[PDB]
Symmetry: D2
Subunit: 264 residues, 4 copies
């Protein structure tokens, strides 16, 4: 059982400025509910009980949201159940040096165990099938190796994401042969894009500590995974469910509008 | 002239629950900018230099936002830093949620014996070729030297969500209020002229507020005190020029968000 | 009746570094109670109902302290709770540390055109055989209707840490101020009547502050503004009754603490 | 070696009420320095690099204190050093259910590894000797078992501390036979009182899980240590150095006066 889920939330969110100068992008609402809460509910379903959060300058709002306070009830029951059932842990990333560096800072909260990772700006809704992390948690029980979530996208979208090169194993399961962070579409090894959902074995921490800066001069978890994938097998998983890239303004709006209609 | 502008920001904003349990509704972003920043910019253009805020349970986000901090990251941060170095922010806590009228009364400590502006940031006002709604009102005030409340004609099916006036046409877009009613059913609406979150208030409004008893939804309403003033002397209603989105409602919040995005 | 009291609390408190990088010096406890609570309680006894606080970077400790959160806990809590339920707290941020004078000028947005009280919390005043210091002053304002600044006689050796006045005796404990100087060297002191952190100021003090240039330590001094006011019209100095500890200094901080302990005992 | 140090800071501090309403007692200043800063310096000297803090209802002041900010320089040298060298982690103790429970909560920040624990209200000032934790860190190296700092106190004081029953192994080292939390004078098994300094082997977490409320209906680390002591060998170390119980106002005052004189 993967008991810990690490949530990186120390990124600038330069694109949602000026509000991200105070409110982490992971705290932005889809209308009435922050991205991070959906992520937490997801991790819970997957079986996690310890939500480890890596924070930046804007630690306050994130931390206060998950601390004790006070169809109203309806709106507050889930966050209340979250606060009661989960143990929240926090560590501060001293400098914005990349996603990989964030996860490496998170070592203080994880220790020597495989663990889950959720990039909250990727809102994944699947409510017909188990949550995305849960799908991967079940896969992990069989494979016992790092797992990276993937989705087919248009080549025109590739330069925004990590892209793999994999060899089919079973339905929707690939053994990652190679990975590249944000390639030009001409250089993209496939249309299989990485999404903010991973299950990582702890040897990943030692690998991160020796992973140099890459794309945008940031320590990328992609390069660490590429290294791991060349020492032993790690898999990529085409999850079932809907994903909105809320790290993008386009995705943020479409998720908000979708929710609005659902609310009807 | 009007140098202070009171910003009530201590209501529950329940329909936006659970995020409002930590993030006040005035802090919700259209996409990248919180409602309150638009209101503040509108107050500045109107000549205000003191931004007085009535806080509730979660003022941490507000105070943090207007406190100094550290291409389009530059252009995204230009106005806010201008606001922070230019304006003077003061604060007072509304002990209990007893109505917009009480929040204004509580705001007396920050105002004193002087006419002032009041902005309800949940009403996002966009004036493109015209001055900000408050600036328009500021001009009016120079002539009339009396309370002024912003109105707009709305379909009668909406009249039940707002305060409504019965008035005498003084001049182009100007009426003398002879009565006001907070949230009447369609059957009883005095007219289709609804009140929006913009007011200029003479200071005798505080003693009136001091004697105003709970009204609609067991809340001390600014509408009821304005009715009292209206019957003691002349106050006016101004059909402002410009587009207003009621972001106090999810439907308005969503429309404003879609609007800003298309303009991006 | 003076209803508002301004509490400057935006200073650095350098002598209490590193703790003052997070906890403003006015929040430092005498053992179990921060300096500022004693000040607020004193203002309340004087009749003030609005506690206008000028903040700096350490606002959080101050703001949270006076906000709602709550014979064991009880008795130790009754006072602060009474305070939080009866008083109205307002805040303004002194954008930059430019001096007590500029801190009070920044405080104008919370005061307005009315006379008001000012308390410098690092000056702990205990005097319960008589009314609190500020209240002694509030009574005096009723008569004189002008600015009042608290003074205490000190040794020529301490004179250099305070503002000092030159006055003329009007009546018991009252002096019409003829001149004021901030932190004069022991040789240049006009007297031994040193100013302490307590004032009642008439509203014209703001306009005077707006034209007061940086004085000692390149900071705008309320002292220089009071000197200006004193030469313009009548303003007095009141020799208060009660004991005062300069908790603005580590020596006075320790003394008051030991003093309180010997009492808690 | 021991890389992490746990710092419980979630207790009520009813003693120092009202200020402890907003500020944790571990944050109370001696004169210009908060208790917790002395403890962190001590831990650092002991070789610790991860400072794991267990927080309560008032974490803002403690977290902000150890977060980047900006003789003023002589005053900020240490904390600047600390903030730039240490890794601080946080976890919330939901209900104040005792020191042992606070430590159990800290499991998420520790994991399965030996770790140190410092109760910051116990101010330990080592003159010519290394820090109390450094002394213990060295001892563990030899013993490889839980270590609990002790001090011989006066019998009339015994009732406010955990007390051991031990057997002399070597200079200032006792194998613990039993432990009781805050026994009355008449029932004290000795005059060797526990002080807020421990090195603990990870099996203490499971034991703590099984430890029911004891003294003052609180889950006590002393009872978990007692259980560990009967289960296998653990030691008590009579440290070299001066200790003030700043958990009591009398101690707080004495420490403040002492620091003042150092001038
Ligand atoms: O120094 C940092 C940088 C980022 N983050 C956080 O890490 C996450 C991801 O950051 P972001 O910049 O938004 O990453 P992306 O550019 O979107 O890319 C990541 O996520 C994509 C899918 O969303 C993948 O396809 C990529 O391979 C992966 O790098 C966010 O939660 C950030 O707040 C930190 O905590 N610290
Ligand atoms: O106790 C309170 C209650 C409200 N507010 C604030 O007051 C404002 C308005 O609150 P809201 O709940 O949204 O009131 P409405 O029902 O929208 O009604 C007000 O605003 C309408 C238009 O926006 C008008 O038409 C109404 O007459 C007027 O009462 C917001 O800024 C709130 O945060 C407080 O600060 N404290
Ligand atoms: O920029 C500033 C500077 C100071 N303060 C505050 O002002 C007060 C006084 O500051 P402090 O540095 O302690 O001034 P002192 O040197 O003590 O001097 C003041 O107080 C003395 C007695 O306490 C008097 O005798 C002096 O005339 C008077 O200037 C404190 O509450 C500070 O926090 C601010 O708020 N902002
Ligand atoms: O629920 C709690 C209760 C306490 N604490 C912390 O635990 C520590 C100790 O609390 P305290 O109340 O001061 O305990 P003491 O009564 O002093 O007793 C402890 O410390 C003594 C020495 O100081 C020992 O002799 C005792 O055996 C040991 O229980 C402090 O750091 C507290 O903040 C928590 O974090 N959570
Ligand atoms: Mg970006
Ligand atoms: Mg992203
Ligand atoms: Mg985009
Ligand atoms: Mg509502
Ligand atoms: Mg509204
Ligand atoms: Mg709606
Ligand atoms: Mg100083
Ligand atoms: Mg001083
Ligand atoms: Mg000194
Ligand atoms: Mg206690
Ligand atoms: Mg103790
Ligand atoms: Mg005691």
């Amino acid at each position: 059982m993967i008991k810990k889920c690490l949530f990186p939330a120390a990124g600038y969110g330069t694109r949602f400025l000026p509000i991200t100068k105070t409110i982490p992008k992971e705290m932005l609402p889809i209308v009435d509910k922050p991205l991070i809460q959906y992520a937490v509910e997801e991790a819970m379903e997957a079986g996690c009980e310890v939500m480890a959060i890596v924070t930046g300058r804007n630690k306050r709002s994130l931390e206060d949201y998950f601390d004790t306070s006070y169809n109203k009830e309806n709106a507050l029951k889930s966050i209340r159940n979250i606060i009661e059932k989960c143990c929240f842990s926090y560590v501060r990333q001293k400098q914005m040096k990349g996603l990989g560096h964030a996860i490496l800072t998170g070592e203080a909260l994880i220790g020597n165990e495989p663990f889950a990772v959720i990039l909250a700006d990727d809102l994944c809704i699947s409510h017909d099938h188990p949550s995305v992390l849960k799908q991967m948690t079940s896969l992990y029980q069989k494979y016992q190796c790092s797992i990276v979530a993937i989705e087919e996208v248009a080549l025109e979208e590739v330069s925004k994401y990590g892209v793999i090169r994999g060899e089919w194993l079973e339905e929707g399961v690939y053994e990652i042969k190679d990975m590249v962070e944000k390639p030009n579409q001409e250089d993209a090894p496939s249309n299989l894009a990485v999404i903010g959902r991973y299950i990582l074995t702890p040897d990943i921490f030692e690998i991160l500590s020796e992973t140099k800066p890459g794309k945008n001069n940031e320590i990328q978890i992609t390069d660490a995974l590429r290294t791991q994938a060349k020492r032993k097998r790690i898999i990529a998983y085409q999850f079932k469910g809907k994903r909105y890239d809320c790290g993008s303004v386009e995705g943020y709006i479409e998720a908000s509008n979708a929710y609005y209609k659902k609310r009807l």
